[PDB]
C-alpha cells in the first residue's frame, strides 16, 4: 500500500510556504513516514519530490553520518555482512532496520536550519 500522487501532491502542497526542518514541515514529514511505511526508495523519491538538489545533498551528508554512527556502533537487527543499510532496509523481511532509517531520515532532515 505505497503512497499515491494524490498523496504526495497534499503533502507537498500543504507545507510548501514552510521551511524544511520547521514544525510544520517536521509534523506533516513525520506523520507520513510513520502512515505510509515506506522503504529507502520511496523516501528518496518523496525528497527529490519535495527538496532542490541543494537540501538534498545536505540531508544525504547528514543521514550518512547519522547512518554511520548509528551501524558502527552496531545494532540489534543489522548484519553487516549483507549489505549497506539503505539495502537491507529495502527488504521487506527487515522492518527493524526500515524503521531505523525512517527515524535516521527524519532527524537528519530535521537537522538541517
Known amino acids: 500500500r505505497p503512497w499515491q500522487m494524490k498523496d504526495l501532491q497534499a503533502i507537498k502542497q500543504e507545507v510548501s510556504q514552510a521551511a524544511p526542518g520547521s514544525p510544520q514541515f517536521m509534523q506533516t514529514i513525520r506523520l507520513a513516514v510513520q502512515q505510509f511505511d515506506p522503504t529507502a526508495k520511496d523516501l528518496q523519491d518523496l525528497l527529490q519530490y519535495l527538496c ?25 537487527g543489522y548484519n553487516p555482512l549483507a549489505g549497506p543499510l539503505r539495502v ?26
Open 52 to 76: 532542490s538538489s541543494l537540501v538534498a545533498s545536505l540531508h544525504h551528508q547528514q543521514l550518512d553520518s547519522l547512518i554511520s554512527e548509528a551501524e558502527t556502533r552496531g545494532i540489534t
Open 88 to 113: 537491507q532496509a529495502n527488504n521487506p523481511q527487515q522492518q527493524g532496520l526500515r524503521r531505523e532509517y525512517q527515524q535516521l531520515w527524519l532527524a537528519a532532515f530535521a537537522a538541517l536550519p
